[model samples]
Structure formats: C-alpha cells, structure tokens
Target: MYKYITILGAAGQIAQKLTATLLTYTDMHITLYGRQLKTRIPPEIIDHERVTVIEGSFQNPGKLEQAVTNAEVVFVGAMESGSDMASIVKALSRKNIRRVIGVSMAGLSGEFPVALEKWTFDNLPISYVQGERQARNVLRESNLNYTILRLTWLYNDPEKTDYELIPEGAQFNDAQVSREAVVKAIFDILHAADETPFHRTSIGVGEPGTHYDKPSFH
Candidate 1:
C-alpha cells in the first residue's frame, strides 16, 4: 500500500473526487498540487489532517520536485502539454519516485476499434490527441514505473461505480464511464500491495456494456 501519494492536478474534477475518496478510505498522506489550489481546494480537503495543499504549476519542475519529494505514488490528474509531462517526469525521477499514474484519452494512441477510432478523432481535437501521445511517449521512454489510465468519455453518475479494464492493443469496450467508477479503479490500484497487471502499462477503462459509436452524452 502507498503511504504517500501526490496528485499533481488536484483541482480537476476526477482528482478532487479521488482526493476525497482517498481521505475517506485510507490513512495515506496526500499532497494536492496545482495552480491557485489553495483557494480552489474544497474545504474538506484543505482541512483534512492527512492532506497538504501546494500551490504550483505542473510546468514548473522545481516546485513539483518539492511536492513529490518522498511521495511513493505520483498522480498526474491534469496536464496540458508534453512539457508539463516532461516536467512531471523530471521531478519524479529526481525524487526517485517510481510509481506514477496518469490519465489520458482512450484513443490518444489510435488503439480503439476502427469505427470508434474514427469517432474519437472526429469528435476530439487532433492536436489534443497528438499532444497527449507525446506525453505518453515520454512516460514510455522513462525508467519510472508508470500506469496510464486511458479513460473513455466521462459523465457524472452518483449511483454508478461499475467499470471494466481493457488492456492495451485490445478494442475498447465502452463509450462512456462514470467519474465514480474511475475513482474506484484508482483507489483499487492504490490499495494493492502487489503489482497489479496494469503496472508499467497503459490500459483502457470505461463502463462495461455501454459500447457505442460515441459517448451517450455526445
């Protein structure tokens, strides 16, 4: 089990939700890092005894180094460019933090089924996909232990938590997934003492049996 986990983009929807879940479910110390997060963080997270809020941009390697220092797991919940990912990798490597988890789009690497792959590029910006691929490539080449969650289109569903894991190279199985389910997946990884099959690989995640041409919300 991870004793300390640092979330680089803690201000994001999934990251914040994950932070809340981590607090409720585990005794790990969490470092929440993002720009202006001091004001943006929810009161429950800011006041939590095991939580430490740090204000810094993920693009800054120096500050990120401090946030990730001694953290067993580093979660990249938000990153906009390859440079941001490079910064994150640099900090983690310098700190000797090996376990890393990051979120990226499901079809960022053209790994979806043909029709779904077309839908992915057609609906999302090509530039965004390319940038995310570059980031993934960076992680792939790094020596750090990394697991990237290739998430499908997401929606808010308070009552749902079911999800399926699709390994790399397999055709993706779902069009949409609930944020709650994604949180559960991350939590499961965090609590596992032994290396899960997802270690050092990128895997697809979405709700099972919801496969469609596009996300139901779209």
Candidate 2:
C-alpha cells in the first residue's frame, strides 16, 4: 500500500534509519520534518521519489500543520517539554490525521529518587504516569487514533538481538535497548496494528540477547 507517512524528527538517529527501512517496504510518500537538515540522510533513501523534506520547528503550529496535512500515519519523535503536548495534540487534531505514534522514555515511574532520576528528567523524560495522562487527553480530545511508545534507554548496539516490551512501571533489567530495535518495533506496530491491545498505553523496552559495544554519542 502506498501510504503517506510524516515523521516529525526525521534528522534524528532513529528516524534516519526508520526512513531508510520504510522506503524498502513500499512506495511510501515520506515527509521528513526537522529543525535543519545537518546529518547525512542516506542518499539512496533521500533520492527516492517518495521522500520529501520539511525544515521547521514544532514550536510553530502553522508549520506543523502544513507538514502533517494529509498524512495517513504520523510519528512524533521530537523532544518537547511536557507542557507542549497540548499544543502538539491541538496541531495534529487540526490535521485530522488517522494515526499518531509518540516517542517517550522508559523508567519514568515517579518512584525513583530525584538524584537517581537526573538523566531521565534532563531529557524532559515524560514520566509513565504523565505520559499516560497526556495520551488519554489526546485520545479523548482528538478524533485521531493514537499509540504511545514509551522506550527504554536507547543504545546503538548491533549485537543485541532479542528484546522485551513490558508494561509501564515494570522493574528495570539491564534497562538498555537499541535504537535500531526501537525503530523496528515501531515498524512492527505499524504493520501489525491488529495485534496491539492498547490504544493509549506505555511500553517498557530492553535488549534480552547478547550485548555489544555501545556507540559514541559525541
């Protein structure tokens, strides 16, 4: 099926790979939205007639609407403060989109101490409870169908193969998942829409197989 998919943060690591993988699935019309096109998106994927790039900020509602209009499936991958969810929901609502998938954190159960929670909090990590709350608000207010993917620590390790997706507030175990695996999971969700039970639920992810060397973020 040739569907129109719009990715909100296409310049990011996962989005780049997801876009590459998605191009192989079918003749998809992909709109890549980001603040600026700095990183190298694979030319093989970018050269595809199905791909389009939109440079802008999610802070501007008008630009967001323009980027998402007529999209069949929308992926929200940008980092925004919790306060911005309302505006994001509002913008997507106006587009009258069919489906929405949001990326969020994993260990934000609001049970850990403040000091131990620094890394997640710094990322403006939406806590499990907060993410659920926001997702419910969007589901109730917007006509668009939604899926909230609460991801665990994202690592770039190819050796790690197997992974587990658990419910929110589950105890952390090794707590690290690959960015590639996360994108694969998203693709799986898009393809197997019938298997998913939760329309508004948080998921915890971690690698279960062999571990590999981590990627240098810098």
Candidate 3:
C-alpha cells in the first residue's frame, strides 16, 4: 500500500528481482534509479505500467535528490561504501521521505558467532567487508527511519522464499540465503501497515539452518 517507492541501483541483480516482485504483488508506483538504465534494465520492467526509470549515478546529488523527493519509501540496492549512505542521508534529510531500507553484507555488525565471524572475515575481501560496515554505520547514525538489512552470501534460486530475520547482536545461523528470500523480506517490510517494528534498526537475513564455513554455492 506504499503509494510511491524508489529503488536505487535498480539494475543490480537483487534489485531486478525485487523490482519484478514489487510489480507483480503491489500497485506502488516504482522509480528505478541507476546509471545507463536503458542498457541495463530489461524491456519488460522499464515498459511496465507502474515503473519509471531515472538514469544517473548516485554520485550526482541533484538527480539523486530528484529521484527520491516524492517517494514514500526508498530501498537502496547498491551500497559499496560509506559515501553511498552519505549521499542518500543528505538527499533525504532535505525531503520528507523517512522509510529508507539499505542493504549491507552480513557480519558487518561483527555480531555473528565468534567462529562464524572469523571464518567470514577470513573468507571475504577485507576491503568490501569494511565498506559494508562503513555504509551501515552511516545509515545507523542518520535521523531517518531506516532499516539496514545485512544479507548473508546470496544465491539465485527463485523457488526459495523461506528465511529467518536475525536481529542485531543475535547469533546468525546461516551462511547463505536465496535472493528471492531476500526479496520476500523486503516485500514484507514494505507491505506491513506499521513501520515501528523495523525502524532505525539493523537486522540479519538468511535461511535458517544453512550455516557453513561459506555459502554452499561457493
């Protein structure tokens, strides 16, 4: 029942899937923001009745601000560094949009079980991990109503939709989650009538009981 929603990095892998799901399940007007969208987003999505595409990089604040000013909710699909959140927070601060959902890598909070934490750090590139943490911190410090979804390693499996939401500081029990499951979590948050439950918090998302040293697909 969101009237308007903006998806930054709208052409990214998970964003594309999320876009399809949103179009299929809801009547919300969707804004897709990214660079070179004509070359990136599929014809089926760009040509959809409720979709609008804005082609630009997140680095350009003027376009970014215009992209989000009318949105009821903003979902960030690409968070590679702290500046990503910085730009979003700065743009949204001037606007009335408060429900912003940002994505980050799991373990950015450093709250996974100790062994799992160590293994994650040991396996992932230190630079990307650090960037994810930086982005999370930026969002966490913002005054906006925000939910930081820290995702575990992702696999593309359209059939899987089950997942568990692990709050920050709780033990994260899974090593991998389907991208479709992640989409479901986002859909649930957007569809919920009340926003207080996820307001200004970071939560972990993954399939329960799939814990491993690394994602099974890897």
lDDT for each residue of candidate 1 in 1-218, tens digit (9 for 90 to 100)? 88899998898999999999999989989999989997888798779899988888876777888999999998999545788888888888889899999998888766777777788788877788778888888888888888899999899897889998889898886889999999999999887778768679988889999868877863
Candidate 3 yields a Cα-based lDDT of: 0.86
Worst 10 residues of 1 by lDDT: 108-117
TM-score of each: 0.95, 0.76, 0.95
The true-versus-predicted C-alpha distance at residue 149 of model 2, in Å, is: 1.7
Which whole-number lDDT from 0 to 100 does residue 52 have in model 1?
A: 88
Q: Which regions of candidate 1 fall more than 4 Å away from where they truly are?
A: none
**Per-residue CA lDDT of candidate 2, range 90-160, in tens?**
77778787677777655456522344345455655346447555644554465556666766567776665
Q: What's model 1's lDDT at 159?
A: 86
Q: Show pairs that collide, candidate 3.
A: none
Taken over the whole model, the C-alpha lDDT of each candidate is 0.86, 0.67, 0.86
Worst 10 residues of 3 by lDDT: 108-117
Q: Tell me the TM-score of model 1.
A: 0.95
lDDT of 2 at 72: 84
